[PDB]
């Protein structure tokens, strides 16, 4: 699919950090997030959803995604999540907002999540 | 895991709508949501990440997931993302804010992301 | 007006913090926000703005405000904006979604901002 | 004052849009805000607060504000409020995220709160 192709591939944010995704025809994301440095240390795992069948209108796509912030060797005890939508094209990007929790106690709750953007480029 | 047997079960949100969720040992968070009202045409997939190892301080365990708005009779263009923080004990609670992305042309972008916060109990 | 009158008093949120408000006819917003603990010296000044002629379906009152960390004897380099709805009737709440961005380098820029929700009830 | 000096005066937004403020002495912003083409009919006050004394070791400068969309002409029975940092040097600029609430009634609240960001320039 259209949504499918598009998606798929390697992406860098506006941090030069490296998002690595695959779209699935079912919906599915599936990939790796790594850090602009490219350390085998810094490379977590993500899983997403997507619309499968965006509209022909000229929007974009729909999407999302989740990392933990655990790996084989570090965890920050957080994750993040993104969501926000794929605009194809010549220079197509996926344009984002995103939360980023980490395990707190209740009484410092208030300060437990983060907020920001994020934008991408297709590297390849 | 208590992470892991803690996080698995059904969910309610404060709207009365269904979080059916299974946490893996890798960290992989997979399940359905449904509407209060338990129709099959108002079923989504859902995926998301948890922290399996959590701190052990008394902090919550981090978690997030994708639902995107499409099953096999409905596509509303858009997805959900949840990130937020589960909480043990004898009330257990999920606590979570999210972003809404709709798929929309880049002159509607500016009202394409709705946000929100949903407090879940766990039933079973 | 209806809008100036219900939104004009004290206000708890539910971390205990007291929140004095007045509402002009204008559609200004002023006063201050103070701890749970009741403590002088953590009294801040408030400004925002609220919709002065709300719609009379059943809609709230949109309003918003600010309050930047400073305060004579303390300074903790950042601002909090809430952005919600005040709801009146039997049991008056406002319902908010907050920002807090802090100041901090370009490089820490991604850690600058908190989210989250806070709700209201009217003191007596 | 530096922050005072830096963020007073006219700002354009990445959507053309326009944002005339000045800061006072005690920590109060107060201007306008009027759309990309100019029209008087678009002019919308605004007023907020932001940290008078930032840190000086790089970091930004802490504020907020807020505009509710009801003028003579036109209400939107919504607000928007804006939380962020000033960054001073050659490229000044103020980066926020914001979240707009519209009224609604309690069924339709979860559809009630757009989030986004606006990186503002200075125009002079």
Known sequence: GSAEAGITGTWSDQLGDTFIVTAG??????????????????????TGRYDSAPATDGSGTALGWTVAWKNNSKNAHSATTWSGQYVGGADAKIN????????????????STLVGHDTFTKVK
């Open 25 to 46: 025809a079912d919906g599915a994301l599936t990939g790796t997030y790594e850090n602009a440095v490219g350390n085998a240390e810094s490379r977590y795992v993500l």
């Open 96 to 111: 984002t907002q995103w939360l980023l929790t980490s395990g707190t106690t209740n009484a410092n709750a208030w300060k």
